[PDB]
Amino acid sequence: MEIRVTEIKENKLLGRKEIYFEIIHEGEPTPSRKDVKGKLVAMLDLNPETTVIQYIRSYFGSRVSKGYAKAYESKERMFYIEPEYILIRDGLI
Numbered sequence: 862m863e864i865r866v867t868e869i870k871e872n873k874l875l876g877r878k879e880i881y882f883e884i885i886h887e888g889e890p891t892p893s894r895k896d897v898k899g900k901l902v903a904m905l906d907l908n909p910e911t912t913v914i915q916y917i918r919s920y921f922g923s924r925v926s927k928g929y930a931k932a933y934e935s936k937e938r939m940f941y942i943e944p945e946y947i948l949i950r951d952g953l954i
Contacts, residue, residue: 862900865882876938882927897926898914911934911938912932913953
């Protein structure tokens with residue numbers, strides 16, 4: 862797969878960077894959340910312990926998946942804001 866970061870928003874209130882990206886996965890199966898996270902962590906040199914994938918979405922008209930990740934300033938902050946299901950399926954809990 863190849864990832865293209867399209868926008869990074871700062872959220873000083875919630876202590877996080879909001880990262881919007883595209884996942885190109887032609888001539889391969891749709892990547893797992895874990896693989897996509899691993900790829901994004903590597904590219905932006907993120908702390909995987911304070912990074913969550915909110916979504917990896919696919920669309921009817923499109924071969925390219927759209928992703929939303931958050932990189933938290935701290936794991937305590939992440940835990941305060943993020944719902945439990947997000948932390949579970951992204952391996953944080």
